[PDB]
Symmetry: D3
């Protein structure tokens, strides 16, 4: 029972995703294609990365992740296919599922993506066992569509991998320095305050996500129940204790400062939108201190 989990920038306004899916079911008759999302900001590899980094532990072993934003479509560039090392615990650290969670064995998931840095945080968080350039005409078209490499060089070969084509056969092995990566912005300790950035607005709720992690917090002594001052955009400070969840803020509309399901320091209002009335946005400065 093979699964391909599919994350693109193709959107859902036309037949582009369906074209890829038609070919996936064509190549791997038994497959199940699960949509991750197709809504990412085009060409923003850092945003694409956040949508895929945390997926392994949720999926059955053997799952292939077809993940693509392909601004270098139709060039001489070729995709990278990697088998990861650890499925890894996550959240605000645990295995996912009922009971004590589902423990995932090492080397049980493959990502196939453009070699443009999309997989940077996947490789940082999970490690990898082996990496290959995707070049074989057994898995890609002999004459690929210049402007559709997300289909030609990701969707199509991912379905061959789902169908059982040996990963080592897709092309030559890539050395670590041949896999492109993006530079991750570092959390700064500024006196005793921690300085990062709004990493994401959490749609559709309007919760605010920072790149300040739970590990960064236990570094400066911060745990659940700590009074914090969190300044956004350099001028809007908020104040609240760190709490597990939204309803701990008290009344509806009140401010909650919490750890999100991905482990990162976040801010919201209790059953109300914070970001949307005050037009708060990704990329704004975020500062925290007790």
């Amino acid at each position: 029972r093979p699964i391909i989990a599919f994350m693109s920038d193709l959107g859902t306004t036309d037949d582009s995703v369906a074209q890829c899916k038609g070919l996936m079911y064509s190549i791997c008759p038994d497959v199940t294609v699960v949509d991750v999302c197709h809504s990412m900001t085009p060409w923003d590899v850092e945003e694409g990365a956040r949508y895929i980094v945390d997926l392994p532990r949720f999926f059955p072993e053997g799952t292939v992740f077809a993940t693509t934003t392909y601004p270098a479509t139709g060039t001489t560039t070729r995709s990278v296919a990697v088998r990861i090392k650890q499925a890894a615990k996550g959240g605000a650290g645990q295995w996912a599922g009922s009971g004590a969670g589902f423990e995932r064995a090492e080397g049980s998931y493959i990502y196939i993506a453009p070699n443009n840095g999309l997989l940077t945080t996947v490789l940082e968080e999970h490690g990898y066992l082996e990496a290959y350039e995707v070049t074989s005409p057994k898995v890609i078209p002999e004459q690929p569509e210049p402007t559709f490499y997300s289909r030609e060089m990701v969707a199509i070969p991912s379905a061959h991998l789902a169908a059982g084509f040996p990963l080592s056969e897709v092309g030559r092995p890539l050395e670590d320095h041949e896999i492109v990566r993006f530079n991750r912005p570092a959390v700064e300790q500024d006196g005793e305050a921690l300085v990062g950035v709004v990493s994401a607005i959490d749609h559709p709720f309007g919760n605010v996500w920072t790149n300040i992690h739970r590990t960064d917090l236990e570094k400066a002594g911060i745990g659940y129940g700590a009074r914090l001052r969190l300044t956004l955009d350099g001028v809007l400070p908020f104040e609240a204790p760190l709490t597990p969840t939204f309803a701990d803020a008290g009344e509806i509309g009140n401010i909650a400062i919490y750890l999100n399901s991905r482990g990162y320091l976040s801010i919201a209002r209790n059953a109300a939108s914070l970001a949307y009335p005050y037009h708060l946005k990704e990329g704004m400065s975020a500062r925290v201190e007790a």
Copy 2:
């Protein structure tokens, strides 16, 4: 051939829904997950209820409906899981339609009133709290009970985990319900609200029902005056469908697929040019 039909307020702009689906396939390898929608206004229990209330008759017997908006996530609250009784009409499908046996569907949802109308329309045979670590995490992620307390246990139920083993039976009073706004009277006009804009067409749906109408003496021929937001008046005979208005753009006053007084333009949008909205008053007279 187990099915989970999935309705949430998680949206489709990140991997939140995919995390839930991943766990569904892990738990029930042979499952088919059907998306209902994930677009609902966050925390609007009456809105989410509208999207799930008439689903059973359309699905194969044995379908599990996983339906969630969870603003009380991470608290001591636990989900409710119910088996409904009557799948409830006409029947849907080709010919005279497909009849559905009683007790053939399970809903699992936060215990916050989301299931209010499902229970009124269909009734139930059994209701339980979802507490067993067989079907939910021992360390549940505080901010993601739509995943922990709905998605995960729905998939155990799809795989044949016995309903009565999820936790203790709930008595009726323990099952939270929302109050639904009444259709009131002033003179011979009926006063209600706009209960929804029908995206993407811009049709207007009111809470004034077939039954409220015929009781006040209105059937499929009646010339009606329909005033919206207390300002915009519309006038037209009650008709079965849009094209009964004649010209493209003409006004149709009709009954939507739920028996509710509705208003639209024929093959054009009514709501969008006039910025008509849910929650606006709707007053009708013959």
Copy 3:
């Protein structure tokens, strides 16, 4: 392993698509339902036609395409079901889709079921058809259809019977060619040495600009990759670039690229930036090309 690929104007904000899907699994339990899209502008049959015309070569033979925008719901009109002839190559070069030399698809191997309102105009034009039938039989539609929901009653439902193996010729009577409603499509005019058409679509979510000037139209004027072109939009915007395979060929990020899209049509874009969104360019605007 039967597939129904589903395209409608029902949107993704309520339970309308799910009702259709439920009834698909009810009638054909082993079916796989693949969403094409549900976002088309309601009642724009020309736009709907664009999202379904290119589908066959990507799908397994025996696939059923349920394609629907239904402004005449609740009327005496009934849907039309067609077996197409050629699965038809396509793309910028014109080839089969898939790895290696692509997946060659046999003739008469796909069914489309749709309102009889012109939605299938380009499907028939580009693929031809082998047989067409009016969808009237109570075996495949409800005896009491919901007046406002013919996308479900007259398309979703019968499509699932067809996917289950219900004989096509049994849905109702054969339709003569003149009984299949069509729309007229704009002809690219050969004006001097220029080619005059329109912006056919904005390519969401990138804001690329698609015209109705097809690759074969370009070969009427003898224009291939490397040709220095002037592509004028909206009468007043004379863009200038060589015709190149892809976006990155334009050099720096933001530079204008003139290219052939994945559907075989003359297009214009910027390299890893949006052309249509900043300047609010729209479908329907004029598009002129010349060398």
Copy 4:
């Protein structure tokens, strides 16, 4: 104490109006310049005409109205200067303006100077005129006018000479009636017992709705204060109210009022709330009235 009342399409965001004013005080030192408005949609002569047609009765006799939208700036066209005949009553009842029984104004006592582009169509129609002249004399316009600024060169400047006492008949040659450009205005049709016109304007900043159905048109059908009316807008909105003098007559705040505006025209509004803004009603929409 000469007055120039000034209406243009120049806006209030730069120094364009001030340049015109400066030259007014330069040519006629004791002048008072009164802004009519500078907000009209550029080049919409019909809208401009609405802001100037009702002016004479409010102003001292001898006032000069400099009224300008000039899309043909820099061309061989020259402005036209007119002495009107009747100052003309008006308003919902039809009377003179001011305290007591109002200020009665004499015949032939106001001058309008404008581009010869139809801007003065309703002025002449409603007031008549006694003499008209092309504005050509270097005594009142520049010998080298700025190509893009004929609102200044061919209207502001000569208007200030006229206010200073420059003889009207000396600006240039007399113009025959057919030489004064006009636009055609929509005729309210007598359809059955209904009267069919349009929404002429949105009354900013209140969002009241003005139609082109005049009080005298209502008296063709015999409609006065107290008459229960149906006023249908945009073909689909049948408003119902008695015809009343004013807004508060409708009762509660927000209730629909149907009334005669201060310009003598059939209008519709809400009592101390906006009708046009919430529902995005627009000029050009249809307006039908009947009793």
Copy 5:
């Protein structure tokens, strides 16, 4: 040299204001008409009031203020004309002008307005010497336009007053209880914090004005140089000392908490807009404390 200072809700998009001005110059040949503003939110008498309350000290003695929003136009209602008592010092309290300012004698300005509460704060701040109902056909039309009382019952009689028509002759005297007034929202002392409201956004800068006055501040001990916490909309707190001016915030974009030229506690950014990016609005809660 008579002056009429003219404040309406008529806007500047049509000839409505010019009609009034034509009649003003008709009635009072020597007059100068100064526009206060015509931009107010229609029918909002509290907003109209803020635009007129502070005008007397700036204008020559003898000035008439014609001030109007007239939602009761065309009814039996009649305007009120009042001679004020004190011109009054103002600002963050002084006379206006070069040197030590221009001292204005008592009873030297007249307001004419609808009797709908528009003049509430004028009468509270300045007092009055005499008040009259405007009813004489020597100053108003015998048949006034039903829908244009701002012209008929304000503009027109104001010009008669400018022209020298005796104020006592416009109609009968009104007793204090016959002059309509609006209820002013009270500043609350909530513990040691002061609770009011955003009274206005200061266009075009996007500065935020509160109804918390300098007097309210010296009541709780607050002067220039006091560290303050100011919460807006119940969730956005800001922190800054109270300073005289914007540039005291330091760098451009920094927050300044100050007293405005009208005497009220205010918040802004130094040469940047505060209200506009965060969509802050009139009517939002405002809380302050040291």
Copy 6:
């Protein structure tokens, strides 16, 4: 017959401008106040400068220009008051125009660069700091120096208060100037910026001047290619006016009333449909 022409960033949505005017009439009973505009983008010194630079030739001799955006309000800063020399062309008005004597106009402004282009184009005969309590308040309102340090002293100057008595003479270096962006070269294309959108018409004005053009070999007949924001290309002959384009909506490339390369549609807006903006690059080639 004294005149004050008044330009500020105070807007027209409250009584800020009326307070200033009130004080002008108090100080100079016989004054005429002319509004220039009050709409300028707050604190944009180059923008406000554009609105005041060519005013003198249009006004009677003896006019005082009160011109202010004052982001440094309430600090130790004091305003500058200058008498300009050459009123500077053609001359404006009927006939051959009205010549203006030298030294006939005074500007008074914050000393923040607002007067940069006025001084470059016209020159000056004398410049002073505004410090005398004869002409400004002793207790100046900290947040309203546009009123205290511009409006009030301008009106004393209109009334005949001697210029040299406002405070001490300033040397040229004490008068703050802004740097103006240069028109540069790349190949035979000239590169500049859009210096303004011409509201309300939506015409586009560039900083590429008549002089920059003719030096590169371009006159009133030249077919030019004009690219805006680095993306949108336009092509058209250089013409005197809009109507030279022919059809309504056609493209005109012309010189605005300041000698600057400009682009527009004939009797339609160019900037608004395309969302063209000030600060966007403008590149021209013959």
